[PDB]
Design a protein around this ligand. Structure first.
Ligand SMILES: Cc1[nH]nc2c1[C@](c1cc(F)cc(N3CCC(CC(=O)O)CC3)c1)(C(C)C)C(C#N)=C(N)O2
Ligand SMILES: Cc1[nH]nc2c1[C@](c1cc(F)cc(N3CCC(CC(=O)O)CC3)c1)(C(C)C)C(C#N)=C(N)O2
Ligand SMILES: Cc1ncc(COP(=O)(O)O)c(CNCC(=O)O)c1O
Ligand SMILES: Cc1ncc(COP(=O)(O)O)c(CNCC(=O)O)c1O
Ligand SMILES: [Cl-]
Lengths: 442, 442
């Protein structure tokens, strides 16, 4: 007593939007530092009937039976996760149930500190995530600033983590968790110096490595597993999996952490796991461990180095004057254009990128940069020689954005009136589509 | 730079567990009250490349561009939802971003009362959900009992909601939220008497209709939209959608609630929405508002009545002596078996059901019942005449379980040892597989 007509037939309205959405992905230069493109195999998992099963709890400790094949999938995922990230299953534990990155973080934090607990993280404006304790004078924007007591540390004037400030803050504030690993930080992290600061106050070291996960896995960047009590990561950015998250915990350093974290995920915060996710995550973690994927990840860094370098060659400034990873933050103060303006301009030419704060910005209103990254385009097969084109496109967009502002005024509502019909944008948008359309596409 | 081989070639290991899992579903009499089977079109959406898009915020108020086609899909989903639940978009709002029922609930509760806020819900043992404030003497098990101050109301010795006790508690405790709508409650809810109790003390009325959503949509059971400030629901149970959730809020009773719910979902709790989910939810929501789906939901109720009736005909006792909805709770105390033992026995015969407390049970340790429901089997095409067979099978399983207990003892360790190889179970298991195996499978 069900309708099994295909999606196109059942709901032609929804299907057109989706076939359009797909075309737009295929014809966009996607420089979102947090985005990627999943392969068919990962998408086959997400469409799998395993999502029908209710499997509350953990394997061999479930509330219901019927979970024999669900148990194998969940154990396979945790196993493959520990292997991919170079950790001993005797020393490290992994929970594969969090629905997404923010959930993963709020859960792991609650586990470690509980309600009212003291946490420290990087300010949003300096490259931290919302779930690292973000609040504002007006309101406690994140649950992590409300269900926890949070203090926030900034980067210095040059866009670097200021460890002297982290210590100064940690000694006066005396928290139970110090968060590191960030959303738009273009350099590697000194976990060693974090681990030393946490020891000095007796706080846990929490590394959120969502943006750099593949680099940690593949040993291209520093390893937070040598120093952290907990490591969280999303599976959908550079790692190239489905939308899900993983919480890692150091059993050896902290006996009794395993139960705290598992009980935080369930039944404190979640109900039933999403097994289609878990399956999809397993599929990708097998690909993550191949040397073929390390090839891909090295290329993300190569493309990102070239991009930074080609952008500097065109007198465009980058925060910290370069990058150690997949992402670049472009400082736009020399052109007198805000980030939103250049985002609008780039959207108008099928260039996907986001506005982003820089060190100088007081508030998060009117950010003076944009953030770009290479995972997506590197997945689409772009190489080091292709970054000059991207850099050229961004230079032309910056110029155009400057032209339009002088004509139409500073106000965004005024600025955008200049956008539709612009012959140079139509020309440029056209140039983008011809190049992007051609690239391979999973 | 990716591998695009099909799931069977890329990962033969995972694919075999999934093909096996598919067999177990096809060959099980699934009476899990909270489970269903999605059609192909909904699974096409879950496997769609729309999951690649990062679209933080809400439509027309995104943090990035590139979200034209995502905005349409999210607007279509909210619209289709307000329609299905027969509410005017002028009077009601819906948020379509929650990743699951549990998340949705914790978000909505936070919106209304904030940290430390006072809530009231049904006890877990009496049929409430974990997210209705469940705690226990040893520990605050749910976050909803920890980040909030909760008090829990029982059902009476016959299994019914005891409104005098709710009033008795509401007047002394003075909460700001009273939760109604449950996980294992076989009868309809007196939403008006709840509204009467909340006005008397000035608390919000929260109805979690996850288990009974299809009935509310189809105007087969009482409509909590007439009385509630907030209505939450999952999309994956009787409604037959993907694993997602919906939060509804009544703007007219509470102007300025819209911003509270929307800001609680993001950025207080979640980050990026899962657009494949939203799409899926939209696809099913079109089906929910059809005469064909009303036919299905009535059939869920017809089956559940016949099942209750065939079980009583075999001298098996039901909590509240019957049902108004899709679910039955069997009281097993006359046979002197626990629910965990009958779950094990039914697992051995490919019968999916869960153990469940009854009013008499003091703790959640050793629940004396099992919970069954008809959505899954009604989806598989079973009619009212087929419930006698299911009743035959459950009566045969209860008999077998009492025999085994006599032979091997009351300890669960010992009980299971009698289960592998049992000639009658192999026999019964085989009769289940032949009947269930045949039925249509989406
Ligand atoms: C959306 C997102 N999620 N995690 C983030 C962001 C960023 C962002 C970028 C932007 F331009 C603005 C905001 N916000 C401005 C203040 C808002 C307060 C309110 O909701 O009322 C919260 C969101 C946030 C960015 C990557 C996209 C970002 C920055 N930089 C960092 N570091 O991490
Ligand atoms: C698994 C599930 N999720 N939401 C639920 C349940 C139920 C259940 C059934 C059972 F047999 C046991 C427990 N628990 C026993 C106590 C546990 C506390 C701890 O973690 O130590 C929490 C889970 C819970 C049931 C539907 C499956 C149920 C009951 N009845 C209700 N009302 O709602
Ligand atoms: C460091 C970090 N942690 C957690 C998350 C949360 O992931 P979910 O969206 O799955 O909740 C993000 C998302 N990153 C925001 C961005 O770069 O666009 C992140 O950058
Ligand atoms: C009333 C109610 N509310 C919320 C939820 C949470 O759903 P998620 O698992 O999607 O978080 C459930 C789960 N019901 C469990 C069961 O009936 O088997 C529920 O019964
Ligand atoms: Cl999903």
């Amino acid at each position: 007593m069900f309708n099994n007509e295909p999606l196109e037939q059942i709901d032609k309205e929804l299907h057109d939007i989706l076939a359009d959405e797909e075309k737009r992905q295929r014809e966009t230069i996607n420089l979102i530092a947090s985005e990627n493109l999943t392969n068919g195999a990962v998408r086959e998992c997400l469409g799998n009937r395993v999502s029908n099963k209710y499997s509350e709890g953990y394997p061999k400790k479930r509330y219901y039976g019927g979970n024999d094949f669900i148990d194998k999938i969940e154990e396979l995922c945790q196993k493959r996760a520990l292997e991919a990230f170079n950790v001993s299953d005797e020393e490290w534990g992994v929970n594969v149930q969090p629905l997404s990155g923010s959930a993963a973080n709020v859960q792991a934090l609650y586990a470690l500190v509980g309600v009212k607990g003291k946490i420290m993280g990087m300010h949003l404006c300096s490259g931290g995530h919302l779930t690292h304790g973000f609040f504002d004078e007006k309101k406690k924007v994140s649950i992590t600033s409300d269900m926890f007591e949070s203090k926030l540390y900034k980067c210095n004037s040059q866009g670097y983590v200021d460890l002297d400030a982290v210590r100064e803050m940690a000694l006066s504030f005396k928290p139970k968790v110090i968060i590191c690993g960030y959303t738009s930080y273009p350099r590697d992290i000194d976990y060693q110096q974090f681990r030393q600061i946490c020891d000095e106050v007796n706080a846990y070291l929490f590394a959120d490595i969502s943006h750099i996960s593949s680099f940690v896995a593949c040993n291209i960047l520093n390893n937070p597993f040598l120093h952290a009590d907990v490591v969280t990561t999303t599976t959908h950015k550079i790692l190239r999996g489905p939308r899900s998250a993983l919480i890692f915990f150091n059993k050896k350093r902290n006996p009794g952490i395993e139960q705290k974290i598992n009980s935080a995920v369930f039944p404190s915060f979640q109900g039933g796991p999403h097994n289609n996710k878990i399956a999809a995550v397993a599929c990708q973690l097998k690909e993550v461990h191949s040397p073929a994927f390390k090839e891909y990840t090295q290329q993300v860094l190569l493309n990102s180095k070239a991009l930074a370098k080609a952008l500097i060659s065109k007198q465009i400034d980058l925060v910290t004057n370069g990058t150690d990873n997949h992402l670049i933050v472009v400082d736009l103060r020399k052109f007198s254009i805000t980030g939103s303006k250049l985002q609008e301009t780039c959207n108008a030419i099928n260039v996907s990128l986001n506005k982003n704060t820089i060190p100088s910005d007081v508030d998060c209103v009117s950010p003076s940069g944009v953030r770009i990254g290479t995972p997506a385009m590197t997945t689409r097969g772009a190489k080091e020689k292709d970054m000059e084109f991207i850099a050229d496109v961004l230079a032309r967009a910056i110029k155009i954005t400057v032209d339009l502002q002088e004509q139409y005024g500073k106000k965004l509502v005024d600025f955008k009136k200049g956008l539709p019909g612009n012959a140079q944008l139509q020309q440029l948008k056209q140039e983008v589509v011809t190049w992007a359309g051609a690239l391979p596409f999973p």
